[PDB]
Amino acid sequence: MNKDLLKYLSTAPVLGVIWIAITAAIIVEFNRLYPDALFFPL
Amino acid sequence: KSKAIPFLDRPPALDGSMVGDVGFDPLNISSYLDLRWLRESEIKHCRIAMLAVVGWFVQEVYHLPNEIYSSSVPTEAFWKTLVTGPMGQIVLWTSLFEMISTPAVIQMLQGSGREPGYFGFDPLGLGKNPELYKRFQLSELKNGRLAMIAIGGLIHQSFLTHMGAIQQ
Amino acid sequence: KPKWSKALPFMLWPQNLDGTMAGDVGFDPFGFTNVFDVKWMREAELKHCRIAMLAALGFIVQELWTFPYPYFSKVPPVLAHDVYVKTGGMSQILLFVIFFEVISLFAVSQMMEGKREPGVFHFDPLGLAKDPDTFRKYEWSELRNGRLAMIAVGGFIHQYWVTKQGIFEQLANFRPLS
Amino acid sequence: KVLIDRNVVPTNFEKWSKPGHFSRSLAKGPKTTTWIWNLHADAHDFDSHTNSLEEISRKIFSAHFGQLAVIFIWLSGMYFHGAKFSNYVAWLNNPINIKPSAQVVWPIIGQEILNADVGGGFQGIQITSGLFQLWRASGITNEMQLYVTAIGGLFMASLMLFAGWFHYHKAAPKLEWFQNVESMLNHHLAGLLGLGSLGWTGHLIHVSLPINKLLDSGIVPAQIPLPHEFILNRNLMSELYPSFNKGLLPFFTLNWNEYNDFLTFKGGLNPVTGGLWLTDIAHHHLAIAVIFIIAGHMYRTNWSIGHSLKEILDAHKGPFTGEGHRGLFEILTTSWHAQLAINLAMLGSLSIIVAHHMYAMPPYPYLATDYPTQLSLFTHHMWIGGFCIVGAGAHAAIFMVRDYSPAQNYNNLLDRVIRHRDAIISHLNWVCIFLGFHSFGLYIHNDTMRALGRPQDMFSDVAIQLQPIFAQWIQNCHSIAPGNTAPNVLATTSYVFGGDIISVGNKIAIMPMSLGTADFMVHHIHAFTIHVTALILLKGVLFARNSRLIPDKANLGFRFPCDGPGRGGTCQVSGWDHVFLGLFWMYNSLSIVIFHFSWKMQSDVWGTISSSGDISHITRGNFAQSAITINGWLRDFLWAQASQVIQSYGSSSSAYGLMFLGAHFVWAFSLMFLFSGRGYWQELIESIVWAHNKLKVAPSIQPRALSITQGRAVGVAHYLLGGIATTWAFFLARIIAIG
Amino acid sequence: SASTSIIFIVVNTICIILGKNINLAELLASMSLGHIISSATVIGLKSLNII
Ligand code: CLA
Ligand code: CLA
Ligand code: CLA
Ligand code: CLA
Ligand SMILES: CC1=C(/C=C/C(C)=C/C=C/C(C)=C/C=C/C=C(C)/C=C/C=C(C)/C=C/C2=C(C)C[C@@H](O)CC2(C)C)C(C)(C)C[C@H](O)C1
Ligand SMILES: CC1=C(/C=C/C(C)=C/C=C/C(C)=C/C=C/C=C(C)/C=C/C=C(C)/C=C/C2=C(C)C[C@@H](O)CC2(C)C)C(C)(C)C[C@H](O)C1
Ligand SMILES: COC1=C(OC)C(=O)C(C/C=C(\C)CC/C=C(\C)CC/C=C(\C)CCC=C(C)C)=C(C)C1=O
Ligand code: SF4
């Protein structure tokens, strides 16, 4: 893959957005599949 | 000068090169629009007219099967074939050709060297001889110029009347 | 190169079509290769060629034969799309097309860097074109068959939408339009 | 002449990983976090990147294609949401009893509550953009037509994105091309506006007219022929509009009166839909098309005929104005900022005209009795107008700092304005004080008198009257004009001036708006707030280059925080700082305009009618007696109408409750930036940096407090966002409940 | 009709005569102004049922 493009994908805002979006997705998907966890079940 | 109008002067743009140049441009529109553009347009009108003239006559005599194709009066033939299909096709396939022709007109004006009206269509090899080519070009233009006026009559006569040319 | 286009004698040979590639008869009137890279366009051309050829043959064979199980069961090709979306068979094909296309992403980037020729995957298991001259001959056939299949597939799908007949059903009867 | 340079700029990603490549100052890279902010702030300040006017012009032209691409994607999205995620078709069938919706939320963390019961078996967010009414007027009757329009939008977006790339990287026009202002005007008048209007007339006559006539007669949408049927089968048209039997012969022979069935001059409103007659709209567009195509033959291009703009300007000079308009042609063909200033002023002013004209002469079917849409459209277009006007001030000031020269402006109108700037600003200062006292002062008088139990001493309709007699007289002229000064018009331009109560369903579409003391008072508030906004912006422009306080201000530039604590203190002298202050006053001004609109319409226009004919207004005519004190606005407007938004939790309007609070938060947060200064913050950051250094986790890009100017920018941006979004939530929650 | 054509011939002729090889831009400009003036005249007279 093109090195200049890869360098662009490594810039702070691009990595910032991608990483936050993945994190946000993980939280969304946990809450979509295991909803309403007010506490750890034990 | 000007052979056609000997009392009026020659059109400045019309030097004496193109075929069918008898110095006929009273309005001198060749000074305002490019002559290659005008000739390209003239030949296109010629060739459409000539086909349309023979179309006018032959449609009287013979017809294809199906009621849509059976209409002696050429003006009436349009209406029954408009929404049906045939005129959709004629438009479509001529549009295709014109879409391909559009960039050729552009690069002519830029200066490719393409003469106006040349599509290089000579299967039988008529006008391979330079001498024959020239006289063939004049006749095309003469006959086309004549057909342009002729098709005008056929249509306008058919408006006045309500039959074809052979019927009238 | 021959100055005037071969396919269009009244138009100049496209400036960025050099005459060397297979399929080149100087046909680019709209001048796509003036602005876009020919390598990119050829990459695309061959991908469409190869997908269409598979499609053309698929349409033909599916109407003449299907696998002898009820899960398959004869349908018209165009309708089969929605049949197998429901079963999950179409998602399976999508799974492996995605896989190959994500890999191809790297191939296309390396092509644009000049490290790979458009359309080349070095795929010749049976070794039908070990000779350079047979390879160039077959390059032309691939393009010609591929270009034909691209249009042909257009025919099949549209004629079905109109006639509501298969390929061979229509050739058996051949009823004209209204 | 077409003048272009080819293959100018290579296309690769090399510079994408080199932030701030475009600027000499930024290309060296950061030493400090200030650099990160500067990168964004300077990205589109193209004339700060280069001195070449040609280079600047090329970037602008290409950026414009970028904007158009974005607008096509947005437009495409609206159509696609219409096709895929809306109750458009259901609404089409029953527009009085279905609320429009074209946004549906996914069921996550309980947010599906927001899918409201809008009717037609549908659940979704109720929209207020007016798209459904637009699409109905266009003759769209099914989701297929919306899908295809959406796809066409994506095609256009891609075409704009290509043109942007092409005209920057591959075929960039030369400066001489851009300076062809005579040719540009001819094409934009005749071509863009003229042919645009003619083309739309074509749609109206051939598609909108028939479909809407059939819809209004009560034909079911699915039973109406598709648009092309009306074109191919003329008899379908001639059934509806008999003049179509005569074809185009009346046009070419100037028997235009033959077309008086589909080209009308009715006035008033369609009684079925409560919108303007489409036959009037068709005639409007045909007339406009003709005028514009003629207008676009004014200027000289490649032939002998036409005017030179320079020659016109140079002739207009009189005994009061020195060299007159001499030198303006040079300004307006060498300064993009000067062009932007004019064009923002006019575009903004136009948006405001659109707001007023669309509520009073509702052009779409079922717009007038969609109260949420009426309120939303007026408010939206007022805001857009305000922001553009403040922008005009910004770009007028930038011109004065960067592009003005004395040699170009010797004793012309521009020079003569700046040579009496003290006379202009002193008088505007006075008129603002006068207006302030004699507008707001009347409310304070009234509050005091009513609190003291002296209603007889108030300015009111039932005490000391201040009747807007001139406005009342104009209303009367407009009401009697049909068949008089407008003899061939059948009905009023607007029922707002007088005449009938138009109703659709049992909802009032439009009716006469009485003007009394409360109307007089609020009009002088608008005069006041607009004059002050003008004062601030005008002062910024006229003192951008220098003042008695700072003789060399232009050398400091457009955007600088101050010139130090000396001379008494010089904070906020720059042109930029006048825009900053002007934004708050524009905000103040337009807030009162939209509040006036909201309350007046609910009190005196919108409501229900009985069969007997008894009007019941949403707030029951309380405006006359309540809108003449500040307490009345606080109580009968803010407190009373906030009941909807404030009681929205646990319902489909709960999003508005949340946005209302969220917007109050953002507003208050803005005050941290506006009231503080960076000296405090830079010191605080020093202690925090100490802790990071101690733990070996300090960044190499050193943390800095925001610049003085950025502090101000952040402050005003949060103030506006918070303030405007609060009103948005307030308005929508209210009007969706009661309207 | 004659009256329509007469007004057109006369008005457009005056536009050519007062317009001052031939210059086609000037001719087209003159005829265009002639059409505008002629159209408004005809339509006007028609409205007064004179023509
Ligand atoms: C590489 C591993 C792999 C695996 C595990 C699967 C698994 C499946 N495929 Mg998929 N598929 C694959 C690759 C794979 N596929 C590839 C490369 C393609 C070409 C794009 C497809 C195209 C495809 C289509 C069009 C469809 C499937 C379907 C299926 C499902 C059939 C369910 C069933 O009832 O089986 C029944 C199985 C048998 C009766 C036994 C068959 C034995 C064969 C030889 C398979 C064993 C292969 C084994 C994993 C590897 C080598 C074995 C060894 C002997 C050499 C199953 C989930 C179908 C589906 O979606 O059903 C709902 C379906 O319609 N696949
Ligand atoms: C398709 C690939 C492509 C590539 C590789 C290039 C490459 C280049 N362009 Mg070109 N350009 C392109 C397409 C492309 N462009 C298109 C489509 C346009 C029309 C807009 C342009 C118009 C253009 C201009 C006017 C300029 C360039 C310039 C450049 C150079 C610098 C770009 C840079 O560093 O900023 C990278 C910037 C970005 C990645 C951001 C772009 C943002 C886009 C345009 C809008 C985003 C949408 C929206 C605002 C998002 C909002 C989100 C929301 C949260 C608010 C670089 C050689 C500049 C130069 O200096 O050359 C000498 C320059 O001035 N380009
Ligand atoms: C008929 C001629 C014509 C037309 C229609 C336009 C239209 C436009 N020009 Mg202008 N322009 C023209 C001639 C024309 N120009 C000439 C001769 C010059 C040189 C003197 C310029 C120099 C110029 C500059 C420097 C700029 C413009 C810009 C614009 C856009 C302004 C923004 C807007 O209103 O969006 C309205 C949007 C639309 C109407 C949708 C897009 C329309 C596309 C481009 C096609 C329109 C024409 C097409 C032939 C119609 C198709 C008909 C169909 C039935 C087949 C607008 C698209 C600005 C711009 O935004 O550039 C990108 C800009 O900066 N123009
Ligand atoms: C056609 C309209 C138009 C155009 C083409 C320009 C063009 C320009 N402006 Mg002008 N301006 C305009 C309208 C316009 N402006 C309007 C309407 C105003 C009043 C607000 C101004 C006031 C103004 C000022 C005060 C200044 C400019 C400046 C500039 C120049 C640089 C802009 C830049 O780099 O910022 C890059 C863009 C950003 C940093 C984006 C910031 C986004 C803000 C905060 C709003 C976002 C809110 C969003 C809508 C909602 C919430 C988002 C969500 C994420 C929470 C550029 C020449 C600057 C200059 O120095 O010129 C020489 C300058 O100082 N403009
Ligand atoms: C200089 C020249 C002179 C000759 C000049 C002379 C007057 C020029 C003659 C040409 C003109 C008048 C013909 C006009 C022809 C106009 C066209 C060609 C008809 C278009 C109709 C369409 C096509 C629409 C029809 C449709 C309608 C809608 C009805 C529908 O039913 C279907 C169709 C059928 C399609 C002389 C005399 C001095 C001699 C000198 O030596 C050389
Ligand atoms: C140059 C050439 C000329 C030819 C020119 C001429 C005009 C060429 C034009 C051919 C075009 C129109 C082909 C168009 C191909 C259309 C495509 C292939 C359609 C894809 C359909 C999809 C694939 C369906 C998806 C479906 C849908 C949508 C939805 C689903 O539910 C179901 C499925 C089933 C998936 C000549 C004639 C002069 C001869 C000369 O010799 C040289
Ligand atoms: C006079 O008014 C003011 C200042 O001076 C004019 C200030 O300076 C500040 C202080 C504010 C600052 C310094 C800006 C805050 C910026 C942020 C949050 C830091 C940005 C950090 C990142 C992008 C990294 C985080 C990474 C991810 C989450 C992915 C305030 C409050 C202020 O009132
Ligand atoms: S307080 Fe700030 S803005 Fe004012 S003079 Fe001092 S440094 Fe400048």
User: Tokens 């009621």 sit at which residue?
Assistant: B67
**CB of D277 within 8 A of CB of D270?**
yes
The string of DSSP letters for B5-54 reads SSSSPPPTT--S-STT-S---TT-GGGTS-HHHHHHHHHHHHHHHHHHHH
For residues B127 and B129, give the distance between their C-alpha atoms in angstroms, rounded to a whole number. Answer: 5
**CB of B28 within 8 A of CB of B11?**
yes
Q: Which of D667, D665, D678, D738 is nearest to D712 (CA)?
A: D678
E3 annotated ligand-binding residue = no
3-state secondary structure of D116: strand
3-state secondary structure of D297: coil
**CB of D213 within 8 A of CB of D240?**
yes
For residues B155 and B148, give the distance between their C-alpha atoms in angstroms, rounded to a whole number. Answer: 11
Under 8 Å CB-to-CB from D626, ≥6 apart: which residues? D632, D633, D635, D636, D637
Sign of the alpha-carbon torsion through C37, C40, C41, C42: positive
Determine the residue of chain C that is closest to A1 in CA distance: C106
**CB of D175 within 8 A of CB of D54?**
yes
In this complex, do E21 and B28 lie within 8 Å of one another by their Cβ atoms? yes
Under 8 Å CB-to-CB from D639, ≥6 apart: which residues? none
For residues C75 and D233, give the distance between their C-alpha atoms in angstroms, rounded to a whole number. Answer: 39
Q: Ligand 2 mean position to C112 CA, how many Å?
A: 20
In this complex, do B27 and E25 lie within 8 Å of one another by their Cβ atoms? no
Q: What are E9's two structure tokens?
A: 């011939």
HEC-encoded secondary structure of C85-132: HHHCHHHHHHHHHHHHHHHHHHHHHHHHCCCCCCCCCCCCCCCCCCCH
Amino acid in position D214: L
Q: Which residues of D touch B83 (CB under 8 A)?
A: 232-233
Which atom of ligand 2 lies closest to the CA of D63? Answer: 20
Directed axis angle between helix D517-542 and helix D421-451, to 10°?
A: 150
For residues D132 and D140, give the distance between their C-alpha atoms in angstroms, rounded to a whole number. Answer: 9
Q: Which residues of B touch E27 (CB under 8 A)?
A: 27
Q: For D109-236, where are the E strands, in sequence order?
A: 116-119, 122-126, 171-173
Q: What are D582's two structure tokens?
A: 């002007």
Q: What are D181's two structure tokens?
A: 């202002």
For residues D538 and D598, give the distance between their C-alpha atoms in angstroms, rounded to a whole number. Answer: 30
> What does this entry list as its resolution, in Å?
2.2
Q: Which of D172, D38, D237 is nearest to D713 (CA)?
A: D38
∠ Cα D106 D112 D118 (to 5°): 105
Pairing mode, strands D171-173 and D502-504: unpaired
For residues D369 and D364, give the distance between their C-alpha atoms in angstroms, rounded to a whole number. Answer: 11
Beta bridge partners of D126: D101
Sign of the alpha-carbon torsion through D27, D33, D34, D40: positive
Determine the residue of chain B that is closest to C31 in CA distance: B103
The Cβ of residue D252 has, within 10 Å, a number of other Cβ atoms equal to: 8
Pairing mode, strands D171-173 and D4-6: antiparallel
b/e sequence D550-582, b meaning 16+ C-beta within 10 Å = beebbebebbbbbbeeeeeebeebbbbbbbbbb
For residues C172 and C174, give the distance between their C-alpha atoms in angstroms, rounded to a whole number. Answer: 6
Q: Which of D270, D263, D280 is nearest to D366 (CA)?
A: D270
Alpha helices in D85-142 (DSSP H): 88-93, 131-138
For residues D92 and D94, give the distance between their C-alpha atoms in angstroms, rounded to a whole number. Answer: 6
- Residue D422 zone, left/alpha/beta (φ > 0; ψ -120 to 50; rest): alpha
% helix, strand, coil for chain B, step of 5: 60, 0, 40
Q: Does residue D121 line the site of ligand 8, with CB under 6 A?
A: no
Q: Does residue D672 line the site of ligand 7, with CB under 6 A?
A: yes
Q: Which of D528, D529, D594, D568 is nearest to D732 (CA)?
A: D594
Q: Does residue D21 line the site of ligand 2, with CB under 6 A?
A: yes
Q: What are B118's two structure tokens?
A: 């040349």
Q: Which of D175, D166, D216 is nearest to D56 (CA)?
A: D175
Residues after which chain C is broken (C–N above 2.5 A) are none
Which atom of ligand 5 lies closest to the CA of B152? Answer: 15
For residues D716 and D667, give the distance between their C-alpha atoms in angstroms, rounded to a whole number. Answer: 9
The best mutation among D395, D556, D587, D709 to test binding of ligand 4, ranked by most ligand atoms within 8 Å of the C-beta, falls on D395
For residues C151 and C154, give the distance between their C-alpha atoms in angstroms, rounded to a whole number. Answer: 5
CA D442 vs. chain centroid, Å, equals 31
**CB of B165 within 8 A of CB of B157?**
yes
**CB of D617 within 8 A of CB of D604?**
yes
Q: Which of D64, D288, D304 is nearest to D296 (CA)?
A: D288
The Cβ of residue D671 has, within 10 Å, a number of other Cβ atoms equal to: 13
Residue D99 to residues D115, D117, D123, D143, Cα–Cα distance (Å): 12, 9, 10, 17
**CB of D622 within 8 A of CB of D636?**
yes
Tell me if chain D has a CB within 8 Å of the CB of B83. yes
User: Tokens 């900022």 sit at which residue?
Assistant: D337
The nearest CA of chain A is from the CA of C40 a distance in Å of 15
Tell me if chain C has a CB within 8 Å of the CB of A2. yes
CA neighbours closer than 13 Å in the CB half-sphere of residue C98: 6
A32 annotated ligand-binding residue = yes
User: Tokens 């407007």 sit at which residue?
Assistant: D637
At D703, phi and psi to the nearest 5? -65, 130
Q: Which of D587, D565, D561 is nearest to D576 (CA)?
A: D561
Q: Ligand 4 mean position to D159 CA, how many Å?
A: 26
Helix (H) or strand (E) holding D102: strand D101-103
Tell me if chain D has a CB within 8 Å of the CB of A34. no
Tell me if chain E has a CB within 8 Å of the CB of B9. yes
For residues B18 and B38, give the distance between their C-alpha atoms in angstroms, rounded to a whole number. Answer: 11
Q: Does residue D165 line the site of ligand 2, with CB under 6 A?
A: yes
The Cβ of residue C165 has, within 10 Å, a number of other Cβ atoms equal to: 16
**CB of D95 within 8 A of CB of D367?**
no
Q: For D215-330, where are the E strands, in sequence order?
A: none
Q: Does residue D40 line the site of ligand 2, with CB under 6 A?
A: no
Using a 10 angstrom Cβ sphere, with 0-12 exposed, 13-18 middle and 19 or more buried, the burial of residue E36 is middle
3-state secondary structure of B79: helix
CA D240 vs. chain centroid, Å, equals 38
Tell me if chain C has a CB within 8 Å of the CB of B112. yes
Q: What are D84's two structure tokens?
A: 């895929």
**CB of D260 within 8 A of CB of D280?**
no
Amino acid in position D62: S
Q: Which residues of C touch A2 (CB under 8 A)?
A: 109, 112-113
For residues D661 and D641, give the distance between their C-alpha atoms in angstroms, rounded to a whole number. Answer: 16
3-state secondary structure of D326: coil
3-state secondary structure of D538: helix
At D702, phi and psi to the nearest 5? -70, 130
Q: What are D726's two structure tokens?
A: 């609060």
**CB of D80 within 8 A of CB of D96?**
no
Tell me if chain A has a CB within 8 Å of the CB of D11. no
Residue D224 to residues D145, D220, D284, D354, E34, Cα–Cα distance (Å): 14, 7, 26, 32, 44
What is the number of H-type helices and E-type strands within chain C?
A: 6, 0
**CB of D185 within 8 A of CB of D298?**
yes
Q: What are D613's two structure tokens?
A: 């004919």
In this complex, do C112 and A5 lie within 8 Å of one another by their Cβ atoms? no
For residues D574 and D578, give the distance between their C-alpha atoms in angstroms, rounded to a whole number. Answer: 7
Q: Ligand 6 mean position to C149 CA, how many Å?
A: 10
Q: What are D658's two structure tokens?
A: 């949340």
Torsion of CA D418, D423, D425, D430, to 10 degrees: -170
Q: Does residue C153 line the site of ligand 6, with CB under 6 A?
A: yes
Under 8 Å CB-to-CB from D494, ≥6 apart: which residues? D360, D361, D478, D510
CA neighbours closer than 13 Å in the CB half-sphere of residue C45: 22
In this complex, do D16 and A5 lie within 8 Å of one another by their Cβ atoms? yes
Q: What are D310's two structure tokens?
A: 């320079």
Query: Which of D254, D304, D305 lies nearest to residue E39, judging by beta carbons?
Result: D254
| Cα diameter, chain D | 92
Under 8 Å CB-to-CB from D162, ≥6 apart: which residues? none
| Cα diameter, chain E | 42
Q: What are D558's two structure tokens?
A: 């457009």
Q: For D414-471, where are the E strands, in sequence order?
A: none
Give the method of determination. Answer: cryo-EM
Under 8 Å CB-to-CB from D9, ≥6 apart: which residues? D168, D169, D172
Tell me if chain A has a CB within 8 Å of the CB of C105. yes
